[PDB]
Design a protein around this ligand. Sequence first.
Ligand SMILES: CCCSc1nnc(C)c(O)n1
Ligand SMILES: CCCSc1nnc(C)c(O)n1
Length: 305
Amino acid sequence: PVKPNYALKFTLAGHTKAVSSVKFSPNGEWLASSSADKLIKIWGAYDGKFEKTISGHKLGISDVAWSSDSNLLVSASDDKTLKIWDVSSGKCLKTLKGHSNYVFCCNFNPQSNLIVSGSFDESVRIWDVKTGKCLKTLPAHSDPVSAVHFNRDGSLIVSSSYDGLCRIWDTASGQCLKTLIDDDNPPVSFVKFSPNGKYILAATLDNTLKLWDYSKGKCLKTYTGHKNEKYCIFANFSVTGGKWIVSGSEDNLVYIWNLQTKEIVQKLQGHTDVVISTACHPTENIIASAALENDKTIKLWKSDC
Ligand SMILES: CCCSc1nnc(C)c(O)n1
Ligand SMILES: CCCSc1nnc(C)c(O)n1
């Protein structure tokens, strides 16, 4: 297809403060959301039906992530901890203590025996899921860490920071393998590996998304047209149908680009505040979007391609 046709299917209301992150479970059945209201909520991925609320953090939550078997969640909070949750029982299995300030981002590795986290304290930490202990503390950046993500086989971690850098780390050794810098270094607000593992996608607070060949250290694609000068907005690869780049925006729209041509192919209208988070369903052409304090809702969109 040349262009997708995402249309609003469901609006999910429940959070009483800004939503911070939405993520689809790997098995495609659920959507998890985190919020400044200190809560995690679980929703049906296909019907938007509210399932349950998971509570325990003492301050707002910035991020949530699923284990590969869709049974566990990890959350990152302003209370300087991460928590590991058994979704079915709602129980907090482990509280990960070590960061000295706000935890902003988190992710399981594919094996899901490890968690990576990034914090306002400018460090990246690697945790053992089963013991809950910190295995490594990486002196990753000189400003708050905005995102952390494992590659397809968990051998690498990419981190981004307001210091303008993206860095690639060897999971096993903790060594910094790459530092990525273009002709300028505006604050990097988000980063993640592509599904095929060949690229990273980085958002900078100069209204720009960039596709990098991280190995060769070269910028391949640039995506613009949206607004992003303040917030750490999640961006995504959509690969279930047409090959798109998906991101939120500070003009309250969801932006969708053709990955190859860099052309904007759709702008999704509906939210009434900054779209801070987007997520792409693992098998269906479905997008979840979430907005900040003046909106508080999550929206589910579906396309035929
Ligand atoms: C009873 C059907 C619930 S709705 C639904 N829609 N799409 C998919 C892929 C799915 O598994 N269920
Ligand atoms: C698992 C492969 C899904 S297909 C795919 N298509 N395009 C890109 C950029 C990508 O990373 N994966």
